[PDB]
Write a protein that binds this ligand. Structure first.
Ligand SMILES: [Zn+2]
Length: 68
């Protein structure tokens, strides 16, 4: 029809691997405020950053502990 990559979620922009999981927690930073639940090596749910980052670098995203 008219499909296009309009990133309405400014700041959450990784379109590799997979989609999302709605109401989950991040296999790294336990954030639950995430609209883009990607998978890690185990197929474990990760928020935009930890999935975006691992996709670039094959590793989790140095950020916080595990719960901030
Ligand atoms: Zn995360």
């Amino acid at each position: 029809m008219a499909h296009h990559h309009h990133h309405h979620s400014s700041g959450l922009e990784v379109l590799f691997q997979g989609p999302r999981r709605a109401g989950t927690c991040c296999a790294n930073c336990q954030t639950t405020t995430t609209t883009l639940w990607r998978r890690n090596a185990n197929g474990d749910p990760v928020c935009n950053a930890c999935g975006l980052y691992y996709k670039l670098h094959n590793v989790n995203r140095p950020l916080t502990m595990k719960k901030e």
